[PDB]
Ligand binder design. Structure first.
Ligand code: FMN
Ligand code: LDB
Length: 334
């Protein structure tokens, strides 16, 4: 099974809590995180893009770096880990994404890929006057279909004459083309989203589910595998979990409870047994060996090819993962 790190490009990472570690996302922190992940043979690092926050006491995701320039800087200080940036497709023309991807292909020596998202959060786009309207919910995947067709032409041949409802290319040129076949990843959960991924993505990100119910997402991965049969392409699922690990199960549970006890309800109001403290994320809470075991269970779910991990504390969570959890995982014996 592959393991990636979801890098905190947003302040406080994925915990919405006065008792959680408090930190701004800086280049240097993301650098320390990704270089530590790489030291422990993490397979990839991904940042999201988040153009508007949720406020409250912790000003949750009010402070966010931009994904392509962050990952270009991280590519320059790494040498093995795969690097993925997220394009919010409403905000960047496809030929710019195509040339940015070529550029980070160059920085990284072929280690770069792109996570394509339609955008769902209307205010992220409305705030800058670029929301298409409420037709967009229904048409997101049509737009994204034309978008990726333009990227495919440009990465494949260096040119595109594509013409659709949303784009008009007139002998559009992008060169250099990527040194390696450019990976596209998607995080579709809907039927349309999974059918998008089945056609154009290398893999699909889905949400892990429950607290300490590691195989609860299985039906989502089942649907994604069914979507992939429709195109004959091999598009596995990567599953997002938060790991809250410690020396014993009791100690990890005490941390989790402590985090939930500091919940920042004001920030939580703007947004809207799993907790909203981490956006109801799939959470694995346990001793190092309990977490290793639960992650081994994820690896056995049909369709599951990797996990994307957040931590309560990235610097020491990556360290304990690599020192205490990973060496116990069957799916990492390679
Ligand atoms: C791992 C992961 C990363 C995501 N990153 C982003 C992001 O950077 N920006 C964003 O607007 N949405 C992001 N999303 C939300 C999805 O792109 C998506 O809209 C949502 O999962 C619902 O699926 P649908 O688009 O099929 O309705 C992410 C989802 C997952 C699972
Ligand atoms: O659930 C989520 N995790 C990270 C980013 C976004 S937008 N949503």
């Amino acid at each position: 099974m592959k393991i990636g790190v979801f890098v905190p490009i947003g302040n406080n990472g994925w915990l919405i809590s006065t008792h959680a570690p408090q930190y701004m996302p800086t280049f240097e922190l993301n650098k320390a995180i990704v270089q530590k992940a790489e030291h422990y043979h993490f397979d990839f690092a991904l940042s999201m893009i988040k153009l508007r926050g949720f406020g409250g006491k912790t000003e949750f995701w009010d402070h966010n770096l931009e994904s392509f320039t962050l990952m270009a800087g991280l590519a320059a200080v790494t040498s093995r880990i795969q690097i993925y940036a997220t394009a919010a497709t409403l905000t960047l023309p496809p030929a710019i994404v195509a040339r940015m991807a070529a550029t980070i292909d160059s920085i990284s020596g072929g280690r770069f890929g792109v996570n394509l998202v339609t955008g769902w959060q209307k205010p992220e786009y409305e705030q800058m006057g670029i929301w298409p309207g409420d037709d967009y919910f229904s048409r997101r995947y049509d737009y994204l279909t034309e978008y990726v067709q333009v990227l495919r032409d440009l990465w494949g041949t260096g040119k595109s004459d594509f013409k659709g409802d949303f784009f008009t290319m007139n002998d559009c040129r992008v060169s250099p083309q990527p040194s390696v076949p450019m990976k596209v990843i998607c995080a579709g959960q809907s039927d349309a989203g999974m059918a998008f991924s089945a056609r154009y993505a290398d893999f699909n990100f889905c949400f892990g589910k429950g607290v300490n119910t590691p195989t609860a997402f299985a039906p989502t991965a089942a649907r994604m595998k069914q979507a992939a049969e429709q195109t004959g392409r091999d598009v596995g699922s990567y599953v997002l979990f938060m790991v809250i690990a410690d020396e014993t199960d009791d100690a990890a549970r005490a941390k989790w409870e402590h985090y939930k006890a500091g919940a920042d309800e004001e920030a939580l109001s703007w947004l809207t047994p799993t907790s909203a403290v981490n956006i109801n994320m799939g959470t694995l809470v346990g001793s190092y060996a309990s977490v290793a075991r639960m992650l081994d269970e994820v690896a056995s779910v049909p369709g599951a090819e990797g996990v994307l991990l957040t931590f309560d504390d990235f610097l020491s969570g990556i360290e304990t993962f690599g020192e205490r959890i990973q060496p116990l995982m069957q799916c990492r014996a390679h």
